[PDB]
Nucleic acid binder design. Structure first.
Ligand code: MG
Ligand code: ZN
Lengths: 48, 168, 49, 49, 225, 346, 96
RNA sequence: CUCGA
DNA sequence: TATAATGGGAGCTGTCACGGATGC
DNA sequence: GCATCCGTGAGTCGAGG
């Protein structure tokens, strides 16, 4: 929604943002026809 | 003759120009609809040579009979296309530019010759400070300007255009 | 994370469009260019390590 | 003999490969559900088991 | 900080002109110059004003550097460095030696120091930085072409800016950008941020990158094939 | 270290004009140009030359270069001759010279004072194929144009008129430089319109549009084929140094064969062809073989007419044509007999 | 690569092996006729299909590439004979 | 990048 | 071609040994 | 005379994509 502070005018709309890849039942993706897997990454945890 | 040695040396501007077959004046590559090299651009057959063996750009000459002949209509030498691997071009700079190898390879060769530190050479080369070539009897803070002196922007402006100020 | 990056780029585009154009006839659709978001996602799923 | 206008640019079995053809897929421009990348008239896929 | 000089007759100097003491300002030579400075002819106030300033030659960039390098007399400097080698302090002998090695390198080679500054930038043959059409009919090209195009654009814009009498800040900026463009062409990443193509973090492959390293020309194409 | 920071500092050195200072400078510039016109009227010289001499004196000896339009090469000698031709004028005439000088000075100061506006505008055109500094410089050119075209009589602020020329310059720059394969500005506008239209269509369709839908949305004169051809012509090249696995592994260029140079096989085939053709030609008399060679271009690289070969051997064109025919006939006979040249026909 | 019908890489270490064997001609062959010598490889193929012995190799193309790329860095690399007189490896094709 | 020696 | 508009905006950083200007 | 910042190397080939 778009709001002008002075006018008080409010315009609202549902906008299309594109697509998001879906994970298959088995935990993988299909990207441009080919099955792919996003491998988990280990890193140093945030903190002090 | 037999190759026995290989020498390497600095190239002078004149040497470079002697290598060149033409100046590249336009940042253009090829034409967007003909897919042929643009004139005076990075792929120009006028400069670097013909794309096809023994054939000018327009097509007035298409055989080996004409060899060394430079077409008058399109300005392309009738020769082997292989020369597009060998013929150099050049770009004539409006202002001189330092060859970074002789600047950043520490210690700087240029900086060593002129007794300039890396910081000073950087400040001059990338336009952060001026350097004096002829003081012309100038005076800064009482002490007269000595040659090869490092002036800031404020100092140089005060010395070259004078001191002044506006008060509201 | 990549979604967040793409969204940030989209937002920059949004403010950029808010500075321009007619100031009374602006719809969400006019301000939002989705291309950088789609690009970030596509980049993640295609060319991420 | 007049030299022909066109030449052989066919897809052939590479050295050391081959077998039995089990599937073909043909995608043509100007046909339902089909839109290839710009300039591409058609794409053919052959599966060899 | 200026000196005023009123005039009742035709003035001999115009605005901008640089002036030394004992210079003919106006009135056929009656009123002259006291200090060093720049001329501001005030027609309203009817006065020749002189803002105190010298006609210094202080330059910036590879123009200045090239000048100083051209001025160098190698043999004299060699003499002085030899005198510096006779010094007791070990450090001064070290520095003098290090300098004298460069000096004598130039002396013995026959190379001129100023040649370390470029006036004409060479352009590699196009077949070594090709623009080729791939299988699908699309085009692939070397980064060198983009580096060269950056260079040419900045150079041409510089020539136009000089042709149209642009101010100092603008020309300085353009020259700086030109130097950086040459630096990107020869050795991208060596100074400052590496040049990248739009929509990518990948540094463009410069002339230095082509030669050196495990993927460089020597190891990848000459010592093995 | 950071060129942008440095430039913003150098820009920060020059203070922003007040309305009065601005108007004053603009006035001085306008009257300066008028003065150059008057000096052209009096001296009979070229306004351009006079402008260049005045500008030369204002700037200094540091910047004295040849101007493209000038019929005379601008060197300190000539500018001194012209400056002495100007200084040798009567008072009321010599006045315009001072007017002009102060005009140029005001010009410089006006640009330099208005270098910030260019930045404030140019910062909105990033990510379009041109560096920030490049955008700034082009915008600066636009600013110069604005300075030279501005008119203070209309009581409009200089920023208003400058912004237009600055935007014009930046946009022109982007449309002229952003692509490696240069595309004419009008075509660039068409391509960008096509893009905006496709994007609107996808924004309304919840998917990317077909060529057909784009054509529909583009109006009359546009069909699917034209959309496709436009998109095809708009395609930018990819880098040969694009990495395939990682930076230390492979480059796209490594997978591209050279199609130009003849392979060893092709070269050897051509060689064997020449040799076999000479072999076959040796079975003819020297004249018929030579006539064939001249008519097919195996000698001096070009095929002669029947009149040229005929004049070369000293016979009628009909005669030489008949000799060519009998030569060919013998070649066909021998070839049918030995079948040594068939395989080269592909 | 097999897909591009490619050749095996004869790397630095393989070269070292040939050097250690003193197999100078085998090595030079790998360097020239077998890879990147255009006149050399063409003539070698033709000679072999003719049943003749392979000819003497000449300059590898990647060395010409090296020379040109050094020229692009404003360095003048010159092949000289024993009398210190320049020898043109580009056969006049690059000299005006 | 992942795999192999 | 004229309302006025006037200083950017990226930035996670877990190795190692040497030659170097330096610069403490 | 001694700690500090910078630039540079860090196995091979082969395969997939
Ligand atoms: Mg239509
Ligand atoms: Zn021609």
């Amino acid at each position: 929604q778009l709001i002008h502070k002075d006018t008080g005018l409010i315009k609202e709309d549902e906008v299309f943002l594109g697509h998001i890849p879906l994970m298959t039942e088995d935990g993988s993706f299909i990207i441009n026809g080919a099955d792919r897997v996003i491998v988990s990454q280990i890193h140093r945890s945030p903190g002090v | 003759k037999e190759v026995r040695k290989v020498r390497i040396a600095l190239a002078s501007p004149e040497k470079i120009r002697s290598w060149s077959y033409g100046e590249v004046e336009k940042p253009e590559t090829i034409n967007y609809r003909t897919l042929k090299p643009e004139r005076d651009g990075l792929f120009d057959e006028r400069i670097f040579g013909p794309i096809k063996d023994y054939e000018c750009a327009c097509g007035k000459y298409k055989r080996q009979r004409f060899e060394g002949k430079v077409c008058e209509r399109c300005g392309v030498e009738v020769t082997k296309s292989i020369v597009r691997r060998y013929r150099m071009g050049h770009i004539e700079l409006a202002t001189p530019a330092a060859h970074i190898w002789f600047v950043k390879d520490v210690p700087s060769k240029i900086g060593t010759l002129l007794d300039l530190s890396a910081t000073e050479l950087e400040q001059v080369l990338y336009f952060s400070k001026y350097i004096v070539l002829d003081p012309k009897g100038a005076i800064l803070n009482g002490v007269p300007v000595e040659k090869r002196q490092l002036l800031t922007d404020e100092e140089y402006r005060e010395l070259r255009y004078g001191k002044q100020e506006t008060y509201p | 994370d990549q979604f967040r990056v793409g969204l940030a780029r989209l937002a920059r585009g949004v403010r950029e469009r808010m500075l321009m154009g007619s100031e009374d006839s602006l719809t969400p659709a006019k301000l939002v260019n989705s291309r950088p978001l789609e690009a970030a996602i596509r980049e993640f799923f295609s060319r991420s390590q | 003999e007049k030299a022909r206008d066109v030449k052989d640019t066919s897809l052939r079995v590479p050295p050391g490969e081959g077998g039995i053809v089990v599937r073909t897929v043909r995608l043509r421009r100007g046909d339902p559900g089909v839109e290839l990348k710009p300039g591409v008239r058609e794409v053919v896929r052959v599966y060899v088991a | 900080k200026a000196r005023v000089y009123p005039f009742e007759d035709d003035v001999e100097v115009s605005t901008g002109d640089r002036v030394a003491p004992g210079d003919v300002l106006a009135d056929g030579g009656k009123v002259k110059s006291d200090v060093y400075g720049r001329v501001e002819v005030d027609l309203v106030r009817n006065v020749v004003r002189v803002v105190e300033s010298y006609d210094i030659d202080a330059r910036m960039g590879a123009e200045a550097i090239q000048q100083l390098l051209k001025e160098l007399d190698l043999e004299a400097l060699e003499k002085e460095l030899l005198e510096e080698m006779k010094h007791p302090s070990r450090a001064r002998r070290a520095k003098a030696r290090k300098r004298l090695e460069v000096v004598r390198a130039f002396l013995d080679s026959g190379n001129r120091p100023e040649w370390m500054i470029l006036e004409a930038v060479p352009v590699l043959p196009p077949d070594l930085r090709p623009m080729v059409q791939v299988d699908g009919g699309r085009f692939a090209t070397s980064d060198l072409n983009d580096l060269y195009r950056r260079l040419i654009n900045r150079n041409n814009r510089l020539k136009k800016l000089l042709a149209q009498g642009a101010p100092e800040i603008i020309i300085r900026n353009e020259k700086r950008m030109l130097q950086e463009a040459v630096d990107a062409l020869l050795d991208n990443g060596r100074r400052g941020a590496p040049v990248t193509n739009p929509g990518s973090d990948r540094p463009l492959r410069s002339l230095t990158d082509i030669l050196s390293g495990k993927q460089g020309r020597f190891r990848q194409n000459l010592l093995g094939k | 270290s950071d060129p942008v920071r440095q430039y913003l500092h150098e820009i920060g050195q020059v203070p922003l004009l007040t309305l009065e200072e601005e108007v004053e400078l603009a006035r001085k510039v306008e009257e300066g140009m008028e003065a150059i016109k008057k000096l052209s009227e009096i001296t009979g010289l070229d306004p351009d030359l006079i402008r260049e001499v005045v500008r030369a004196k204002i700037l200094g000896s540091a910047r004295v270069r040849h101007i493209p339009g000038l019929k005379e090469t601008l060197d300190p000698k000539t500018v001194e001759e012209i400056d002495q031709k100007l200084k040798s004028l009567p008072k009321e005439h010599k006045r315009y010279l001072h007017i002009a000088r102060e005009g140029e000075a005001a010009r410089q100061h006006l640009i330099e004072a208005n270098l910030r506006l260019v930045v404030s505008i140019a910062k909105k055109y990033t990510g379009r194929g041109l560096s920030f500094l490049d955008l700034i410089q082009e915008g600066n050119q636009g600013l110069i144009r604005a300075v030279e075209k501005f008119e203070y009589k209309r009581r409009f602020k200089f920023s208003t008129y400058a912004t237009w020329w600055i935007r014009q310059a930046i946009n022109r720059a982007i449309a002229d430089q952003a692509r490696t394969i240069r595309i004419p500005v009008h075509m660039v506008e068409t391509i960008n319109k096509l893009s905006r239209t496709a994007r609107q269509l996808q924004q309304e369709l919840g998917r990317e549009p077909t060529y057909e839908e784009i054509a529909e949305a583009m109006g009359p004169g546009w069909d699917a084929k034209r959309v496709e051809e436009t998109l095809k012509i708009a395609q930018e090249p990819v880098s040969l140094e694009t990495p395939i696995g990682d930076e230390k592994d492979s480059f796209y260029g490594d997978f591209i064969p050279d199609e130009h140079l003849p392979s060893p096989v092709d070269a050897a085939t051509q060689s064997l062809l020449s040799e076999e053709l000479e072999k076959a030609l040796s079975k003819l008399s020297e004249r018929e073989a030579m006539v064939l060679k001249l008519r097919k271009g195996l000698i001096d690289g070009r095929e002669h007419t029947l009149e040229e070969v005929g004049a070369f051997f000293g016979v009628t064109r009909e005669r030489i044509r008949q000799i060519e025919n009998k030569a060919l006939r013998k070649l066909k006979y021998h070839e049918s007999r030995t079948r040594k040249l068939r395989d080269f026909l592909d | 690569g097999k897909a591009q019908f490619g050749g095996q890489r004869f790397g630095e270490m393989e070269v070292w092996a040939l050097e250690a064997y003193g197999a100078a001609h085998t090595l030079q062959e790998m360097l020239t006729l077998k890879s990147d010598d255009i006149e050399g490889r063409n003539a070698a193929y033709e000679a072999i299909i003719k049943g003749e012995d392979v000819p003497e190799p000449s300059v590898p193309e990647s060395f010409r590439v090296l020379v040109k790329e050094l020229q692009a860095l404003a360095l003048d690399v010159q092949t000289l004979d024993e009398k210190d007189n320049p020898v043109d490896i580009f056969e006049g094709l690059a000299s005006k």
